[PDB]
Write a protein that binds this ligand. Structure first.
Ligand SMILES: NC(=O)c1ccc[n+]([C@@H]2O[C@H](COP(=O)([O-])OP(=O)(O)OC[C@H]3O[C@@H](n4cnc5c(N)ncnc54)[C@H](OP(=O)(O)O)[C@@H]3O)[C@@H](O)[C@H]2O)c1
Ligand code: SF4
Ligand code: SF4
Ligand code: SF4
Ligand SMILES: [Zn+2]
Lengths: 93, 57, 147, 88, 138, 176, 370, 111, 204, 43, 106
């Protein structure tokens, strides 16, 4: 997902390329760097924007099973879709 | 019986290594937070010592 | 040659078959150490015996908390051990101090006194996880003693 | 021999009655995956009306009264009689 | 009575292979016992359980020969068993690929990795510090 | 309700004295001690062969730290630092930053196994249910560096155990 | 584990000074910087064995500060698990005592039974041993539906299991030669030493804690307290075996009497709210947010509790301010009480007699923390 | 009317003289019976540097408390308890200290 | 009402707040406190032995047993240490607290002739706090190291200590001591604003 | 709903002892076997 | 007969009567106006009136004592030592020692 560095070591969730003059690179010589294949930033845009009929909708993961506090999002603004503070899920109308 | 009352300044007997003379104490009452508008952290004296060197490990 | 390489496997297999431990108590961990003897999670199924034998023993399992008072006590024992020796830090205290890391009297996790080969992570180190203190140790014996 | 029929006679013979209640004893009536999803009951709260914290004081009466500066601390601890199930 | 127990042992050897079958199980595993098989697992693990036998009888989870590239035939530990240990081996009742399957998320890895040890591809720590930048230029 | 221990000399005359004297001249109680151990040999050994048979466990078990995520990607953790404050070992370290796109999430997330007494407060103090304790034992290492878990990089490798985690959490909501 | 500096005049021990405190983990100062909910699992790790007998003494001491009676059901969990610790503590009190002497079999006989005992702990709480379960808000999590049938099934099979020890160890000529007449202390000096556990209870003095001072729904449950005749190790052994026999009766009566209802304290100002409840309503989530980070805000003052341990007394002495941090608490565990007696217990006794003293008193080295 | 610990003003100094007399005779016992380690001469110099720190005599209570403390930390080696050269080593030998100077401490890193 | 605890034996136990006070010494009594069926009496340090001989074998108050000998360290007062003698009666079934006060370095009259268990707890206070006790036989360090500086509990010095780090360095047998570096303890500044409790606040 | 049903029938040992005489107690009987084995032995 | 503690398994009647008559003379030496003399006398004479009323009765031994007759004598054996210590070191009559500094509230 993330772009590979010219030095060798792969970048994490945040832009974390180790400096050429930095000595803290010996750790990844011999043994591999653990970098996650699935990046969360690209997965937000991958999920489609759902449509809402009413003015205000409440967001939930899946009831009491999936962890989410019930947050109501106002959908008065036409430009830029409304999103909850927990999920990357967006809502229109 | 046998009082032997002597008036003198207090001294440290059960004391650690040479670090007491260098470090300076700041006995000052803690100020109320900017966001929290409640007086309970105040009205009680706090003796906090001056912070030394800190670095990322 | 090929004959020497196969002979070195037999020497490694001699330790891989049987390991006789000097298990240190001085912990809540010591009860979970005693659960190795418990029939449900059998350890005498391996070449491991609870006879201890302090002078003879090979793999000392340091279970739990190491205080400053017991710090010179465990070090002098480790010196008396025979040369093929391994150290298993059992429990979060023996790793790096689970609790009591910021306490004055506790040494911060064995390695500052005695070098550790295999780390057992769990506070109550479950007899499931403790069988990685034997089988993973037996797996780790490759050595590659060439010359 | 490993046959249970002949062995059960030997273990019953050598000190005390056995047969039932084995060493392993995890054959029957051991429920795996516990149960179907249950509903946990609510206490004297949850149901609305007359649920004030004014009535449910909790941490209110705590202030210690300073006292003064033949009486016993309690009626003396009388000894209890021997057990009816077993005398000794 | 003794003849019936001897016949049960001979039938057990005839069940799992034979002369070459039972000998392969006796050398690799601690004890050889016959039972009903679950079968379905990524990297051919047997997991033949279901038998009443004794206490905690989710018996015989036989490890696959070379799961990823370790050649586990003479030496094998509990490094195997891809996401099925909670049901077929420990806690739950229903078999993972037969009765109750785990729900798809499209985030979990399809191939399960072995135990992290002294071998390459081992764990290593790092910090998220961006650091306070210093400015010096001609 | 007052039991007693001592019998206060049961022997009196002839019949009650000689049988008590019999277990000192000859043994008998040694044979009676032999009898209980004899019956104990013939009953089957309750042993579990570790790499093939496994010991019984619970639906809610604490042992391995791994942070869960939503079904449609997206990191579930919010960086409240709530789990940091409850942590009795003060093991879990957390630095919070905005992810430049509105959402407030994590940057540094180290839960060192040198500390942590596996109490499971962080499992029960998380409002979003990010840290769920996976039933795992397979994490014995050679070094400290290999043991202490880094900033999400080894914890989002707990996605390989998330098939069990999503099934075991079905006992958590509406408790057991 | 223990130093035990011996002064041998010839063969008999004259001056036995136990130079203990070799495991001073420093629980005293370390708790001062932690809140009441945060400092809870420390007292599990006080003793090696007790988990629901421990924390029980602490949670009731916090309850005495907060003036809160726990729910009726939670108290019945506290006795059911309080007695199952009383069963667990006396396993080690016999087996490791036998292991220190040289008995090989009876150690393993109870440890298979003990491993089946921790299956009850596992299914009720995530950890194997040290379970953060008995909390200031009564009981954290409810019993699963599977366990209540398995508790009865275990106690049915335990009847013959406890009979194994009395048909093996008590009737032996070796034990009646060894353990009989070592440190015969029945005197009123033992009151001055104040052992309170099995020394006073198992010899002469009728007094205990369970009957005189009820803590969680007592008098309703029937008890038989074993009291010996002489102050020797063998009478202290037999009363513990009779305590093991008179503990299943408490468990069975707990199985008969289970009132269905709430688990945590009804007030959400002390007990953390349920997960299904906290995710919807505002008041609950704030209370969930504030019961973590911050403690409880305890009323200032000093409380003292001592719920009867199989080893002795967990004398919790919490000193409290208006803040959420308890500034110095002390649990004077039976360790300091029993090790004080060894100056009198060892006088005119052999080296091997000292080994028998430590086991029957059950000097667990974890007790020496405060 | 007031506590005096052990001695009043003058006799407390004689207790230090009594403490120095006893501890001067115990340094051959901490070499032959215990372990050689350093030297007999350097062991007696280790005593002098300890008492030079306690040059601030102002109260009879402070002096006597140091005598009672001295009758335990130096009494530990008389009736030999577990130390085994790792413990009971007062002089720092493993760590090298930085000298008190405005040019030396600033170059290395202090305050 | 469900949730609080009820008290009824408070008035019966308050009689001792008069009984011991009616003996009336300035040598002993000073201040008497009683709350939630427990008695706290704070006694002048000069008399401790004659105080503990009373409540022992006395016909009205027969305690005989000492369970706890805890000590409270508090920097607010000139008298720094508040040593609490916790007594338990087995004949009358009641608990009492014999509190005292001692400053920075003053000996108290130790209860060795009164109680035979006191000596072990007396050694513990001298270790943790540094409070010396007069008329005590063999005062030794138990919990501390045989070469430990200061007193482990005292609120003057930090939680981590001073000689915490112990290496097996270049010297073959000698374990290092004087190095003072350690991993940082995150001292969380948690203290809730607004006073939660009435009948506790005092006017300046 | 989570509840407990009492299955009480055989509660266990309520001060009950299973220590029963087995294989014939001595007194005078085992001595007659003992001396009897000697008399049969010598003859 | 068998006593609970290490105290001798014997019941000596009138020996208890000697000890209680002796301590009444001990109390009347220095304290006369002090309450320690006032409170101890009204308990001891209350017990003496009940001992003289019933001889060698199990109910008489149970009167505010609980245990055996030898245990009740042991509960009065060190009471003579407590009375003798009160005579030598006396806080009952005088009150002169210094009050503490005004700080006790936490
Ligand atoms: N006091 C003195 O003896 C003295 C006097 C004057 C100068 N020096 C100098 O100071 C140094 C002191 O070292 P030492 O003599 O104490 O070392 P040493 O004890 O002889 O040990 C040498 C170690 O280095 C490794 N090694 C050496 N050469 C190697 C090679 N070509 N390839 C791979 N591994 C190699 C060996 O490992 P493997 O066994 O795995 O190969 C061996 O364990 C010497 O180099 C010497 O020049 C010493
Ligand atoms: S790791 Fe846990 S069980 Fe082991 S010694 Fe430490 S606190 Fe005790
Ligand atoms: S793990 Fe949970 S409580 Fe901790 S920061 Fe993440 S979301 Fe918040
Ligand atoms: S399990 Fe407990 S000790 Fe471990 S990280 Fe979570 S809160 Fe901290
Ligand atoms: Zn959402």
């Amino acid at each position: 997902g993330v772009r590979t560095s010219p030095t060798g070591e792969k970048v994490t969730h945040t832009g974390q390329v180790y400096d050429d003059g930095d000595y803290r690179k010996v750790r990844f010589v011999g043994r591999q760097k653990e970098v996650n294949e699935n990046f969360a930033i690209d997965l937000i845009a991958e999920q489609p924007v759902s449509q809402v009929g009413s003015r205000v909708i409440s967001c939930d993961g899946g009831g009491g099973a999936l962890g989410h506090p019930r947050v109501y999002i106002n959908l008065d603004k036409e430009t830029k879709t409304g999103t909850c503070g927990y999920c990357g899920l967006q809502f229109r109308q | 019986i046998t009082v032997d009352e002597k008036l003198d300044i207090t001294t440290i007997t059960g004391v650690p290594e040479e670090h007491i003379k260098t470090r300076k104490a700041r006995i000052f009452v803690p100020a109320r937070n900017n966001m929290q508008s409640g007086v309970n952290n105040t009205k009680k004296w706090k003796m906090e010592f001056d912070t030394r060197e800190r670095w990322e490990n | 040659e090929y004959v020497v390489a196969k002979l070195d496997d037999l020497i490694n297999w001699a330790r891989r078959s049987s390991l006789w431990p000097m298990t240190f108590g001085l912990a809540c961990c010591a009860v979970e150490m005693m659960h190795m003897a418990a029939p449900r999670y059998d350890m005498d199924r391996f070449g491991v015996v609870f006879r201890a034998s302090p002078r003879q023993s090979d793999v000392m399992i340091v279970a739990g908390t190491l205080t400053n008072k017991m710090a010179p006590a465990l070090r002098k024992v480790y010196d008396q051990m025979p040369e093929p020796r391994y150290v298993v830090s059992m429990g979060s205290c023996a790793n790096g101090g689970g609790y009591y890391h910021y306490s004055y009297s506790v040494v911060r996790g064995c390695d500052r006194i005695v070098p550790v080969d295999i780390y057992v992570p769990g506070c109550p180190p479950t007899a499931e996880a403790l069988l990685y203190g034997i089988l993973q140790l037996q797996k780790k014996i490759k050595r590659e003693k060439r010359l | 021999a490993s046959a249970t029929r002949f062995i059960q006679w030997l273990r019953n013979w050598a000190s005390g009655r056995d047969l039932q209640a084995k060493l392993q004893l995890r054959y029957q009536e051991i429920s795996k995956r516990t149960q179907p999803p249950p509903k946990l009951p609510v206490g004297p709260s949850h149901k609305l009306s007359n649920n004030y914290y004014c009535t449910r004081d909790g941490r209110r009466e705590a202030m210690p009264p300073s006292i003064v500066m033949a009486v016993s601390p309690a009626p003396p601890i009388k000894r209890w009689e021997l057990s009816q199930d077993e005398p000794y | 009575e003794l003849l019936q127990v001897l016949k049960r042992g001979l039938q057990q050897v005839s069940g799992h292979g034979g002369l070459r079958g039972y000998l392969r199980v006796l050398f690799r595993a601690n004890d050889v016992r016959v039972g009903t098989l679950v079968g379905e697992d990524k990297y051919g693990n047997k997991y033949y359980e279901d038998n009443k036998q004794f206490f905690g009888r989710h018996r015989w989870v036989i490890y696959t020969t070379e799961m990823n590239g370790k050649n586990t035939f003479w030496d094998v530990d509990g490094s195997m068993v891809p996401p099925e240990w909670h049901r077929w081996l420990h806690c739950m009742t229903d078999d993972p690929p037969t009765v109750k399957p785990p729900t798809a998320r499209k985030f979990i890895w399809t191939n399960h990795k072995f135990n992290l040890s002294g071998t390459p591809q081992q764990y290593v720590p790092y910090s998220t510090t961006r650091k306070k930048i210093q400015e010096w230029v001609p | 309700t007052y039991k007693y221990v001592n019998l206060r000399e049961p022997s009196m005359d002839m019949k009650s004295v000689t049988d008590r004297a019999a277990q000192t001249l000859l043994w008998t109680e040694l044979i009676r001690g032999l009898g209980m151990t004899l019956s104990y040999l013939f009953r089957e050994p309750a042993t579990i062969n570790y790499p093939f048979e496994k010991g019984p466990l619970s639906p809610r078990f604490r042992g391995e730290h791994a942070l869960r995520r939503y079904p449609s990607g997206e990191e579930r953790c919010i960086a409240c630092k709530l789990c940091e404050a409850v942590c009795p070992a003060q093991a879990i370290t957390i630095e919070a930053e905005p992810r430049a796109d509105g959402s407030r999430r994590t940057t540094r997330y180290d839960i060192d196994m040198t500390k942590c007494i596996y109490c499971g407060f962080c499992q029960e103090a998380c409002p979003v249910d990010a840290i769920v304790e996976g039933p795992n034992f397979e994490f014995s290492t050679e070094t400290h560096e290999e043991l202490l878990y880094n900033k999400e990089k080894l914890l989002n490798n707990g996605d390989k155990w998330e098939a069990e985690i999503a099934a075991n959490i079905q006992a958590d909501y509406l408790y057991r | 584990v223990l130093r035990l500096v011996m002064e041998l005049s010839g063969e008999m021990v004259r001056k036995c000074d136990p130079h203990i405190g070799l495991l001073h983990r420093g629980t005293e100062k370390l708790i001062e910087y932690k809140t009441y909910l945060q400092a809870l699992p420390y007292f599990d790790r006080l003793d090696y064995v007790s988990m629901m007998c421990n924390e029980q003494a602490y949670s009731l001491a916090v309850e005495k500060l907060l003036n809160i009676r726990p729910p009726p059901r939670a108290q019945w969990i506290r006795v059911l698990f309080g007695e199952i610790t009383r069963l667990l503590n006396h396993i080690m009190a016999v087996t490791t005592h036998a292991l220190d002497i040289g008995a090989m079999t009876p150690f393993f006989w109870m440890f298979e039974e003990r491993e089946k005992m921790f299956e009850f702990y596992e299914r009720v709480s995530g950890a194997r041993m040290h379970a953060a379960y008995v909390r200031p808000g009564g009981v954290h999590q409810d019993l699963p539906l599977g366990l209540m049938d398995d508790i009865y099934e275990f106690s049915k099979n335990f009847s013959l299991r406890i009979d194994e020890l009395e048909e093996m160890l008590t009737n032996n000529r070796i034990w009646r030669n060894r353990t009989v007449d070592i440190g015969i202390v029945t005197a009123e000096d033992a009151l001055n030493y104040g052992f309170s556990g099995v020394m006073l209870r198992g010899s002469g003095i009728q007094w205990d804690l369970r009957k005189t001072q009820p803590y969680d729904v007592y008098d309703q449950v029937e008890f038989d307290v074993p009291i010996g005749s002489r102050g020797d190790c063998y009478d202290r052994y037999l009363c513990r075996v009779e305590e093991m026999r008179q503990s299943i009766r408490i468990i069975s009566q707990c199985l008969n009497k289970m009132p269905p209802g709430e688990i945590k304290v009804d007030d959400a100002k002390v007990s953390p709210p349920k997960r299904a409840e906290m995710k919807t309503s505002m008041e609950s989530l704030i209370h969930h947010f504030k019961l973590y980070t911050e403690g409880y805000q305890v009323p200032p003052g000093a409380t003292y509790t001592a719920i009867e341990a199989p080893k002795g007394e967990f004398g919790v002495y919490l000193v409290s301010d208006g803040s959420s941090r308890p500034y110095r608490c002390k649990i004077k565990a039976p360790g300091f009480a029993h090790l004080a007696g060894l100056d009198k217990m060892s006088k005119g006794h052999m080296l091997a007699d000292v080994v028998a003293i430590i086991g029957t008193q059950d000097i667990v080295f974890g007790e020496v923390d405060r | 009317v007031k506590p005096i610990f052990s001695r009043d003003m003058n006799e407390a100094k004689r207790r230090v003289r009594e403490l120095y007399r006893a501890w001067y005779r115990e340094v051959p016992n901490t070499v032959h019976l215990f372990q050689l380690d350093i030297s007999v001469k350097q062991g007696r110099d280790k005593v002098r540097e300890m008492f030079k720190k306690n040059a601030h005599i102002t109260d009879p209570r402070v002096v006597d408390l140091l005598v009672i403390k001295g009758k335990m930390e130096l009494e530990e080696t008389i009736k030999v308890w577990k130390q085994r050269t790792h413990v009971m080593r007062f002089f720092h030998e493993t760590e090298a200290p930085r000298p008190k100077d405005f040019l030396s401490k600033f170059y290395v890193g202090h305050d | 009402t469900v949730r609080p605890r009820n008290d009824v034996a408070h008035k019966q136990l308050s009689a001792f707040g008069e009984y011991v006070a009616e003996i009336l010494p300035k040598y002993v009594q000073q201040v008497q406190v009683s709350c939630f069926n427990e008695l706290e009496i704070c006694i002048h340090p000069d008399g401790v032995i004659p105080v503990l001989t009373f409540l022992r074998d006395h016909s009205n108050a027969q305690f005989k047993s000492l369970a706890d000998l805890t000590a409270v360290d508090i920097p607010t007062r000139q008298n720094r240490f508040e040593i609490v003698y916790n007594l338990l009666s087995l004949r009358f079934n009641s608990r009492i607290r014999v509190k005292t006060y001692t400053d920075e370095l003053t000996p108290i009259e130790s209860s060795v002739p009164v109680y035979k268990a006191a000596n072990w707890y007396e050694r513990e206070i001298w270790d943790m706090f540094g409070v010396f006790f007069a008329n005590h036989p063999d005062l030794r360090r138990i919990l501390t190291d045989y070469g430990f500086e200061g007193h482990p509990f005292r609120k003057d010095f930090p939680l981590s200590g001073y000689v915490e780090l112990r290496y097996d360095d270049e010297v073959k047998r000698v374990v290092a001591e004087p190095v003072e570096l350690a991993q940082e303890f995150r001292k969380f500044d948690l203290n809730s604003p607004w006073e939660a409790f009435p009948a506790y606040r005092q006017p300046p | 709903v989570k509840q407990d049903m009492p299955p009480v029938g055989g509660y266990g040992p309520i001060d009950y002892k299973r220590n029963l005489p087995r294989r014939g107690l001595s007194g005078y009987s085992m001595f007659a076997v003992g001396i009897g084995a000697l008399l049969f032995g010598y003859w | 007969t068998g006593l609970v503690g290490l105290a001798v398994c014997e019941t000596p009647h009138e020996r208890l009567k000697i000890l209680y008559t002796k301590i009444l003379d001990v109390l009347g030496h220095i304290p006369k106006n002090a309450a320690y003399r006032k409170y101890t006398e009204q308990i001891t004479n209350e017990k003496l009136s009940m001992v003289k009323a019933e001889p060698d009765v199990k109910k008489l031994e149970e009167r505010l004592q609980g245990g055996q007759i030898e245990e009740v004598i042991l509960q009065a054996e060190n009471e003579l030592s407590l009375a003798r210590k009160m005579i030598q070191w006396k806080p009952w009559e005088p009150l002169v020692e210094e009050p503490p500094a005004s700080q006790w509230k936490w």
